[PDB]
XYZ file of C-alpha atoms in Angstrom:
319
model
C -76.704 -14.017 51.610
C -76.392 -12.247 55.034
C -72.971 -10.955 55.165
C -73.384 -9.213 58.559
C -74.838 -12.244 60.234
C -76.589 -10.575 62.819
C -79.915 -11.953 61.523
C -78.788 -15.686 60.811
C -77.056 -16.183 64.257
C -80.208 -14.412 66.006
C -82.584 -16.519 64.456
C -81.214 -19.631 65.944
C -81.693 -17.925 69.499
C -85.491 -16.933 68.787
C -86.324 -20.425 67.475
C -84.746 -22.064 70.660
C -85.786 -19.070 73.125
C -87.544 -20.178 76.525
C -88.365 -16.788 78.140
C -89.218 -14.561 75.110
C -91.253 -14.613 71.842
C -92.765 -12.627 69.245
C -96.528 -12.288 68.984
C -97.061 -12.130 65.129
C -100.657 -10.933 65.828
C -99.280 -7.751 67.499
C -96.871 -7.291 64.409
C -99.736 -7.480 62.082
C -101.756 -4.920 64.091
C -98.926 -2.575 64.514
C -97.806 -2.811 60.983
C -101.929 -2.007 60.031
C -101.607 1.055 62.419
C -98.304 2.478 61.182
C -99.067 1.987 57.498
C -102.469 3.845 58.034
C -100.956 6.983 59.616
C -98.207 6.712 57.163
C -95.549 7.304 59.594
C -92.813 9.669 58.713
C -89.499 8.194 58.865
C -87.566 9.879 61.769
C -84.482 12.163 60.869
C -81.030 12.543 62.843
C -81.261 15.534 64.811
C -77.592 17.221 64.308
C -78.924 20.315 66.550
C -78.798 18.050 69.569
C -75.095 16.944 68.789
C -71.727 18.738 68.379
C -71.046 20.164 64.780
C -67.649 20.494 62.996
C -65.784 19.430 59.932
C -65.578 15.956 58.449
C -62.555 14.797 60.340
C -63.477 16.148 63.860
C -67.410 15.129 63.266
C -66.023 11.476 62.142
C -64.067 11.335 65.428
C -67.209 12.752 67.538
C -69.473 9.827 66.247
C -66.720 7.342 67.137
C -66.365 8.738 70.460
C -70.212 8.990 71.020
C -70.897 5.528 70.087
C -67.918 4.174 71.587
C -69.451 5.238 75.099
C -73.189 4.763 74.116
C -74.313 2.114 76.645
C -75.685 1.515 80.046
C -77.497 5.011 81.697
C -79.830 3.527 84.157
C -79.554 3.311 87.914
C -80.695 5.152 91.049
C -80.268 7.936 92.136
C -80.810 8.612 88.091
C -77.811 10.257 86.400
C -78.823 13.413 85.137
C -76.801 16.568 83.766
C -77.955 20.320 83.612
C -76.935 22.366 80.329
C -78.115 25.918 79.121
C -80.946 25.647 81.697
C -82.287 22.089 80.885
C -82.119 18.876 82.482
C -80.951 15.461 80.494
C -80.936 11.945 81.344
C -80.329 8.714 79.412
C -78.771 9.039 75.886
C -79.631 12.610 75.447
C -77.551 13.559 78.686
C -74.620 11.611 76.958
C -75.038 13.726 73.736
C -75.542 16.955 75.879
C -72.195 16.155 77.980
C -70.004 15.620 74.942
C -71.581 18.946 73.249
C -71.047 20.858 76.674
C -67.310 19.759 76.890
C -66.715 20.056 73.192
C -68.273 23.710 73.260
C -65.874 24.363 76.316
C -62.933 23.465 74.548
C -62.285 20.042 75.905
C -60.532 18.383 72.916
C -62.621 15.206 72.644
C -62.124 14.695 68.936
C -58.248 14.507 69.204
C -56.729 10.918 69.420
C -53.951 12.419 71.526
C -56.370 13.343 74.297
C -58.665 10.686 74.063
C -55.588 8.093 74.260
C -54.637 9.608 77.650
C -58.139 10.595 79.110
C -58.618 9.470 82.839
C -61.639 8.791 85.305
C -61.110 12.440 86.602
C -61.671 13.761 82.944
C -64.831 11.674 82.204
C -66.070 12.288 85.840
C -65.837 16.221 84.971
C -67.452 15.505 81.351
C -70.281 13.694 82.693
C -70.844 15.533 86.175
C -74.355 16.084 87.318
C -76.799 14.428 89.797
C -75.757 10.860 90.503
C -72.697 9.439 88.514
C -72.930 7.928 85.174
C -72.705 4.127 85.242
C -69.594 2.240 84.326
C -67.268 5.581 84.636
C -64.072 3.526 84.945
C -64.937 1.081 82.016
C -65.838 4.240 79.727
C -62.238 5.723 80.488
C -60.833 2.656 79.623
C -62.796 2.390 76.128
C -61.954 5.771 75.300
C -58.321 5.329 76.102
C -58.466 2.364 73.671
C -60.260 4.384 71.322
C -57.711 7.097 71.079
C -54.500 4.557 71.131
C -55.824 2.569 68.066
C -56.961 6.044 66.328
C -53.438 7.339 66.627
C -51.571 4.160 65.993
C -53.493 2.495 63.106
C -55.493 5.452 61.456
C -53.338 8.473 62.058
C -55.776 10.181 64.348
C -58.509 10.071 61.783
C -61.562 7.902 61.754
C -62.379 9.050 58.424
C -59.271 6.729 57.116
C -61.402 3.787 58.508
C -64.549 4.965 57.082
C -62.962 5.437 53.461
C -61.339 1.739 53.425
C -65.091 0.767 54.020
C -65.975 1.744 50.407
C -69.544 2.965 51.206
C -70.536 -0.454 52.744
C -72.060 -0.295 56.183
C -71.260 -3.977 56.619
C -67.669 -3.429 55.556
C -67.489 -0.575 57.997
C -68.869 -2.700 61.061
C -66.293 -5.385 60.317
C -63.556 -2.781 60.157
C -64.799 -1.025 63.372
C -65.142 -4.221 65.324
C -61.593 -5.681 64.289
C -59.758 -2.389 65.064
C -61.702 -1.650 68.223
C -62.300 -4.541 70.594
C -64.539 -2.606 72.677
C -67.181 -2.669 69.619
C -67.154 -6.775 69.669
C -70.772 -7.327 70.610
C -71.184 -10.799 70.193
C -72.657 -13.385 72.792
C -72.781 -17.222 72.850
C -76.333 -19.147 73.245
C -76.405 -22.869 73.346
C -72.603 -23.105 72.152
C -73.246 -21.048 69.177
C -71.748 -17.391 68.416
C -74.608 -14.658 68.291
C -73.810 -11.416 66.498
C -75.363 -8.169 67.706
C -73.000 -5.191 67.063
C -75.314 -2.640 68.584
C -72.907 0.329 68.931
C -70.960 -0.368 65.587
C -74.208 -0.471 63.807
C -75.773 2.771 65.430
C -72.202 4.261 64.384
C -73.006 3.928 60.712
C -76.505 5.345 60.903
C -75.028 8.347 62.838
C -72.521 8.854 60.116
C -75.440 8.739 57.768
C -77.444 11.160 59.590
C -74.507 13.621 60.628
C -73.203 13.741 57.122
C -76.578 13.894 55.453
C -75.886 10.734 53.061
C -72.771 12.417 51.614
C -68.889 12.024 52.123
C -68.019 9.825 55.288
C -71.793 9.217 55.673
C -72.613 7.807 52.180
C -73.693 4.214 52.189
C -74.997 1.912 49.445
C -76.100 -1.080 51.587
C -78.082 0.459 54.690
C -80.627 -2.041 54.071
C -78.165 -4.746 55.796
C -78.166 -3.021 58.952
C -80.403 -4.547 61.622
C -82.219 -3.112 64.732
C -79.846 -1.976 67.445
C -80.402 -4.373 70.297
C -80.564 -2.175 73.501
C -82.831 -1.665 76.341
C -85.582 0.844 74.952
C -86.362 -0.803 71.762
C -87.343 -4.079 73.462
C -89.421 -2.124 76.015
C -91.297 -0.683 73.224
C -91.882 -3.720 71.355
C -93.228 -5.467 74.760
C -95.335 -2.016 75.095
C -96.866 -2.614 71.504
C -97.575 -6.453 72.294
C -94.946 -7.563 69.960
C -92.649 -8.953 72.717
C -93.882 -11.298 75.356
C -91.965 -12.622 78.441
C -92.354 -15.571 80.528
C -93.356 -14.706 84.051
C -89.840 -15.006 85.596
C -88.453 -12.364 83.220
C -91.568 -10.473 83.239
C -91.170 -10.242 87.303
C -87.506 -9.446 87.145
C -88.185 -6.316 84.794
C -91.073 -5.119 86.948
C -88.783 -5.465 90.200
C -85.949 -3.702 88.362
C -83.589 -6.795 88.913
C -80.359 -6.880 87.072
C -80.404 -9.471 84.140
C -76.789 -10.353 83.884
C -74.845 -9.634 80.505
C -74.380 -13.050 78.483
C -77.199 -14.781 80.249
C -79.770 -16.876 78.257
C -82.406 -14.110 79.307
C -80.497 -11.182 78.018
C -79.367 -12.834 74.652
C -82.964 -13.956 74.023
C -84.360 -10.347 74.810
C -81.619 -8.952 72.304
C -82.202 -11.499 69.475
C -86.255 -11.320 69.602
C -85.514 -7.431 69.327
C -83.430 -7.924 66.120
C -86.306 -10.256 64.750
C -89.195 -8.267 66.249
C -88.120 -5.285 64.380
C -87.358 -7.398 61.086
C -90.894 -8.975 61.332
C -92.358 -5.557 61.545
C -90.344 -4.258 58.581
C -91.512 -7.345 56.541
C -95.268 -6.810 57.606
C -94.877 -2.780 56.750
C -93.494 -3.763 53.328
C -96.433 -5.900 52.619
C -98.606 -3.073 53.373
C -96.970 -0.765 50.819
C -94.794 1.158 53.327
C -91.127 0.198 52.716
C -88.758 1.113 55.332
C -85.102 -0.194 56.360
C -84.720 -2.157 59.575
C -82.831 0.992 61.069
C -85.519 3.401 60.210
C -88.037 0.964 62.060
C -85.604 0.961 65.097
C -85.305 4.950 65.066
C -89.284 4.863 64.839
C -89.608 2.469 67.995
C -86.854 4.194 69.925
C -88.765 7.576 69.299
C -91.978 5.907 70.844
C -89.953 5.060 73.877
C -89.446 8.729 74.808
C -93.300 9.138 75.050
C -94.424 5.640 77.048
C -97.410 5.912 79.367
C -96.766 5.508 83.033
C -97.282 1.827 84.242
C -95.323 0.630 81.181
C -93.137 -2.423 82.215
C -89.771 -1.232 83.070
C -86.871 -1.841 80.382
C -84.428 -4.491 81.515
C -81.513 -3.504 83.333
C -78.289 -5.255 82.332
C -74.718 -3.873 83.378
C -72.746 -4.029 79.995
C -70.306 -2.250 77.812
C -72.467 -3.096 74.637
C -75.540 -1.038 75.192
């Protein structure tokens, strides 16, 4: 039915939500506009990432998505690389690229397993400091350890065992690498998100151009990637609506605690916002997979007008 269980478990949240809802009129309006413009599906930009052979690139994607979370804060974390300034996700991508290019062996499980605060401070050196520096070091050490101990240093061994199932791979990654266990509890019930583990599958698909380690037969089963940028875009487009208390917290850039009802409601409504939009597009002759609709929304999130409600700020390891 729903092997992944993200849709099923999040629908419970959306039905009961107190601080967030979906405006289905906004969904329709946005579906109409996107179908008319015939929006091209975005493609994965391999030029912005490090490139290598299958073994090192597979490990690279694991490392990338292992620390792919939580970039916000003042003073804004920025890096300078080849005469250009980067922030957010693009600073993560550029940072890893810079380090790999300069001979930091970030694809070697041996190095990852023993990486420290000092090494990570250097890799992400720039204006300010990347949030959650110590937690990123701990997660990379976990990632290297498991890679070395369980997969002979090769993420390719994990990907192979998935048998070209996205769902199978998410299960393998979340079991083997505890840092990827992105689940919450809402009104006594487990809620599955798996943001980092899911975006890892789409990154493999992108980086390997649908071949070899990037070949998957069930990409349709991926949901949206419940982060802080996608809900921001959905709110901007009128699809997500917030109760006044939560709206004001976002406006004031007030931290919304991880695991809180409000945080889980935003993430669940993100999942179902994207799913309702996908359905509405299919209706109008423009069939896309949920992950493509995410990529599409995430894109708009780079081009938002000033005066847009700020994205929600949660300190967490999962996004």
